[PDB]
Design a protein around this ligand. Structure first.
Ligand SMILES: On1cccc(C(F)(F)F)c1=S
Ligand SMILES: [Zn+2]
Length: 257
């Protein structure tokens, strides 16, 4: 099945998921010189005050911090979006070395990691119906650079020991995702896709310009997770990122001058 190795990585996905070579695939390189300021964009509204985290899961590709999305509790709206999108989970993509790991790049620059906060358009009723629509998802993408620790990340890092292998989960209540945001909400936005199979083309990407800083010790703990299940040979969960895809007939818009 799919993964990130020589034999089952991104260059192979198209054979089971032909939409891998589609017209609005993610991630992309963000060419800062080419991305035009759009003054019709609205400020982004991130309302995470009532977010209710439930659980963290190692899914064999990444770890997902899952939220109760049965009520309008934690929502993203504004920016390029029409309507209201509900937070369902966040996860990261990261590298084996600090020089790589993000999926979007900025003028070809790769960051050490990238946080994806996943939200579904509540006009579609649930997540499953939202991923059958071209405006079904909104993902807030935030880059990580290695420097000072991010205090709001430490509760995630400290639980990782308990979900080392594929299929392991742990209780993860009362986590506040506001602690993972940078100061500024300036962003770039473009229409794209999931960056893992099934690669569906449902996503309004909103990529913040300002990275957050995490410590070398924090990202080193991400890299001690395993892609394999318990009792299987150890394969470190590193380099779970897809490289930049052709932009095709798309424009990337900036919310800021
Ligand atoms: O990485 N990944 C995995 C599953 C779903 C998504 C999303 F957010 F696009 F829906 C992503 S980015
Ligand atoms: Zn992702």
């Amino acid at each position: 099945h799919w993964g990130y190795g020589k034999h089952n990585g991104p260059e192979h996905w198209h054979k089971d998921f032909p939409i891998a070579k589609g017209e609005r695939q993610s991630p992309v390189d963000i060419d800062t010189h080419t991305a035009k300021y759009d003054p019709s964009l609205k400020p982004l509204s991130v309302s995470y005050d009532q977010a209710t985290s439930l659980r963290i899961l190692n899914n064999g590709h990444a770890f997902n911090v899952e939220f109760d999305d049965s009520q309008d509790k934690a929502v993203l709206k504004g920016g390029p979006l029409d309507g209201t999108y509900r937070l369902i989970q966040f996860h990261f993509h990261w590298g084996s070395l600090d020089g790589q790991g993000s999926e979007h790049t900025v003028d070809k620059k790769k960051y050490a990691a990238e946080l994806h906060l996943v939200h579904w358009n509540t006009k579609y009723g649930d997540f499953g119906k939202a991923v059958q629509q071209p405006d079904g998802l909104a993902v807030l993408g935030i880059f990580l650079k290695v420097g000072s620790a991010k205090p709001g990340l430490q509760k995630v890092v400290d639980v990782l020991d308990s979900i080392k292998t594929k299929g392991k989960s742990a209780d993860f209540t009362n986590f506040d995702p506001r602690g993972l945001l940078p100061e500024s909400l300036d962003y770039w936005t473009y229409p794209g896709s999931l960056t893992t199979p099934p690669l569906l083309e449902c996503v309004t990407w909103i990529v913040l310009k300002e990275p957050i800083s995490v410590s070398s010790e924090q990202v080193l703990k991400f890299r001690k997770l395993n892609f394999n299940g318990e009792g299987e040979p150890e394969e470190l969960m590193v380099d779970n990122w897809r490289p930049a895809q052709p932009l095709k007939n798309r424009q990337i818009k900036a919310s800021f001058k």
